[PDB]
Amino acid sequence: ELQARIAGEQAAIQNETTKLQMIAQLRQAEQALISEQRRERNMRILSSGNQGMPTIQ
């Protein structure tokens, strides 16, 4: 029974390893999202689809 319990404990540790891997992947993904949002902002500012002007009055 103790052999089986320790084997299950190794299983839980392996599951923790999997969780850490997924957390790392998610962190890199959300860094990519942040870079994408920065590009969205700089595209909105610089875009050629705008036509307004600073007026003289």
């Binding site: 909105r44 500012i45 875009s47 705008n50 307004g52 600073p54 007026t55 003289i56 009055q57």
Partner: protein, 49 residues
Amino acid sequence: DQWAQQVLNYGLLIVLFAAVFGLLMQIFGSYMADLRFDGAQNVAYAIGG
């Protein structure tokens, strides 16, 4: 005579630049204070202006 001519010259100079440069600076100030960097005004258009 030449001193009188030079006095007249630089008096004309101060008058002309006073009036003209005051007008030009007022126009430029209004224009560029109106300028804003956001998603409404084409930045290339404003900088060219």
